[PDB]
Amino acid sequence: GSSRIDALEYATTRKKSEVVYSGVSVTIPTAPTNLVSLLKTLTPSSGTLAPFFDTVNNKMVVFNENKTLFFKLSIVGTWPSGTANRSMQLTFSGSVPDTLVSSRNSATTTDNILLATFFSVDKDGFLATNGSTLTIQSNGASFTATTIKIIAEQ
Amino acid sequence: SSRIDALEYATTRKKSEVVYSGVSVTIPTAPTNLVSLLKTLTPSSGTLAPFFDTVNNKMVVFNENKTLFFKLSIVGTWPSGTANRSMQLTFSGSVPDTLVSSRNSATTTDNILLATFFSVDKDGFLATNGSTLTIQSNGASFTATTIKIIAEQ
Amino acid sequence: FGSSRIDALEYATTRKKSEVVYSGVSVTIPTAPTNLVSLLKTLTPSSGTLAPFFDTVNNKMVVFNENKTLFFKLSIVGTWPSGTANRSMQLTFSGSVPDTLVSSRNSATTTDNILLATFFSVDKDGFLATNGSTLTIQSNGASFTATTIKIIAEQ
Numbered sequence A: 001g002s003s004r005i006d007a008l009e010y011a012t013t014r015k016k017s018e019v020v021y022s023g024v025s026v027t028i029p030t031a032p033t034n035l036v037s038l039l040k041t042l043t044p045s046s047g048t049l050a051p052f053f054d055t056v057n058n059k060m061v062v063f064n065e066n067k068t069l070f071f072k073l074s075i076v077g078t079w080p081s082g083t084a085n086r087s088m089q090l091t092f093s094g095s096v097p098d099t100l101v102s103s104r105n106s107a108t109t110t111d112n113i114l115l116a117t118f119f120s121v122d123k124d125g126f127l128a129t130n131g132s133t134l135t136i137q138s139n140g141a142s143f144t145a146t147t148i149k150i151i152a153e154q
Numbered sequence B: 001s002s003r004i005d006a007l008e009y010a011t012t013r014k015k016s017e018v019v020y021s022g023v024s025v026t027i028p029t030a031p032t033n034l035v036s037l038l039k040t041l042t043p044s045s046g047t048l049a050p051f052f053d054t055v056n057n058k059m060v061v062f063n064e065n066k067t068l069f070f071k072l073s074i075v076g077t078w079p080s081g082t083a084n085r086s087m088q089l090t091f092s093g094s095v096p097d098t099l100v101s102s103r104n105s106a107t108t109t110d111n112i113l114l115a116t117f118f119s120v121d122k123d124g125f126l127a128t129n130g131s132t133l134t135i136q137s138n139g140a141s142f143t144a145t146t147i148k149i150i151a152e153q
Numbered sequence C: 001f002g003s004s005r006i007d008a009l010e011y012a013t014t015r016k017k018s019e020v021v022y023s024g025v026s027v028t029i030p031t032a033p034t035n036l037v038s039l040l041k042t043l044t045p046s047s048g049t050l051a052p053f054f055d056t057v058n059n060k061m062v063v064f065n066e067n068k069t070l071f072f073k074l075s076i077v078g079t080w081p082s083g084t085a086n087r088s089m090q091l092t093f094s095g096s097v098p099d100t101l102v103s104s105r106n107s108a109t110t111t112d113n114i115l116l117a118t119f120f121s122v123d124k125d126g127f128l129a130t131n132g133s134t135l136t137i138q139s140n141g142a143s144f145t146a147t148t149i150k151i152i153a154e155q
Ligand SMILES: N[C@@H](CCC(=O)O)C(=O)O
Pocket: A094, A095, A098, A118, A119, A120, A121, A122, A123, A125, A126, A127, A128, B017, B071, B150
């Protein structure tokens, strides 16, 4: 059972890109923006875009395995003073595209954002074959981010 | 090795991943049983079984201490001109869970992504009873044109 | 062969959790920042236990020192006062970078029930493993009165 134990150890070992950008000043505009293209201009405070964020094709990529990928994006920042209705959205291309939206209104005063989801990657499936283009967009006004934490794990 | 066989089972994902393409599905402002709604459609890929029970119109789970991950991705629209709007999805359970994706005038897109998990216990409420999923559009009716639903455990 | 490695794999694939249900309660979530563990710990659970993931001495969520992700869910049945239009529930987790969850709604939505779910990619010997997380909850728009609460952390 030696080889099968090796395989199980691999199967139960988390693979991850956990990248933190601290003390930055990054504009997330109201026009759609490729998130990998935006981030790769910055120097991480810790972590690396590789292996989950491909800086050649500007996409999230996955391991070709029947193992689900968990994704989280935590953004510290602000919209302009007085911005009432506002949201942050993030779309992932795929066989069916997924659009995350975090909306708020005047009742909420914090502007910090937390988006989380998962992708049920199939071997030789769409994500494994093509990757995913991540398109971020701020709604209501432009957003200025000062800390960004992005995680993809599988 | 029985223990290695078991570990391979334990670490193998079980899933329903069902896609409905090119449809025009009304999600009304009144509560609607989601499994009942979907089973009137023909998947472009995947199968409702084993996680979506079309006899009792509910989500069902394996009787295992293994968490179920759920995602509903909808490409669709609220009517042109709709400002305040939301999509909600309730799961029955010992304590019912109500997911809400709300938005307002600031957001143009009407596409929806609801993701959550259920910490299934052996012999617990979900394993025993399953969960009725009740979907409802708020602010106006909604029309779904692509639906992707995933339950995995 | 490989007995210890198999033991370790069985441990790695065994979910550890706190799942606490508070049924038939009346809990005010005010408009000011409020420590969530402090708020819950005086309530007698209907089922489950706050320990080990919710530490009632330091009022923090705490984690096992393992390279294993923690999944978190908070399900709340309750209400804002009648007529409350714009409203949200906010939950912040301290961390190297704090995470701020918001569930907002407006006049279009009648239900006041709330579901917040997320995960934390715990690293062995990392920030959460060493410090835990202070969970701070706040109701926006008006005070919220919770009557059923289900809280889960698993790793
Ligand atoms: N199974 C799809 C992903 C489904 C999802 O969006 O989670 C793929 O491998 O591309």
